[PDB]
Swiss-Prot record:
The modification Pyrrolidone carboxylic acid is found at residue 1. Keywords: Electron transport, Heme, Iron, Metal-binding, Periplasm, Photosynthesis, Pyrrolidone carboxylic acid, Transport. Cytochrome c2 is found mainly in purple, non-sulfur, photosynthetic bacteria where it functions as the electron donor to the oxidized bacteriochlorophyll in the photophosphorylation pathway. However, it may also have a role in the respiratory chain and is found in some non-photosynthetic bacteria. Binds 1 heme c group covalently per subunit. PANTHER family: CYTOCHROME C. GO terms for biological process: photosynthesis. GO terms for cellular component: periplasmic space. This is Cytochrome c2. SUPFAM superfamilies: Cytochrome c. It comes from the Bacteria. InterPro entries: Cyt_c-like_dom (IPR009056), Cyt_c-like_dom_sf (IPR036909), Cyt_c_1A/1B (IPR002327). It comes from Cereibacter sphaeroides (Rhodobacter sphaeroides). The keyword Heme applies. Signal peptide: none annotated.
């Protein structure tokens, strides 16, 4: 949204160590074939913990999705900054833990990356 998608595309390289954005036709829009985390194509508005081919979600992420968490900009920028804290607050369970061990230190980068995803990773 108010973020800068081009700056986001650059900031997304950090995420490629574990993620990929491949569309429904098999085209790689961003990534290096890493499969640690789920495919981010179609994340916008997706219920957390539901990508059909990702078999590595933790129980905290599955729980949050069951609670009704779908990815929007406000939840996405809180989550990428500290995934385990975010999951504990949302879920209401303090023992919750995220499998994503990367924390994005800059808020601006979080908003830019969200604007980049609204440009390339929205599924119809
Ligand atoms: C590996 C060390 C990772 C890096 C680098 C990043 N992510 Fe990640 N991400 C990873 C895993 C293992 C998972 C599963 C989390 C779990 O607890 O189950 C995730 C998940 C996400 C999600 C949720 C998507 C969904 O399907 O619900 C998002 C929105 C996400 N990751 C975004 C993201 C971004 C933008 C990154 C770069 C700043 C990033 N991740 C890095 C592992 C790793």
């Amino acid at each position: 949204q108010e973020g800068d998608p081009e700056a986001g595309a650059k900031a997304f390289n950090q995420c490629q160590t574990c993620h990929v954005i491949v569309d429904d036709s098999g085209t790689t829009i961003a990534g290096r074939n890493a499969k640690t985390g789920p495919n981010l194509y179609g994340v916008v508005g997706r219920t957390a913990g539901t990508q059909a081919d990702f078999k590595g979600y933790g129980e905290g992420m599955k729980e949050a999705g069951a609670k009704g968490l779908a990815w929007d900009e406000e939840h996405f920028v809180q989550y990428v900054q500290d995934p385990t804290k975010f999951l504990k607050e949302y879920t209401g369970d303090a023992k919750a833990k995220g499998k994503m061990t990367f924390k994005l230190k800059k808020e601006a980068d979080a908003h830019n990356i969200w604007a980049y995803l609204q440009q390339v990773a929205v599924r119809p």
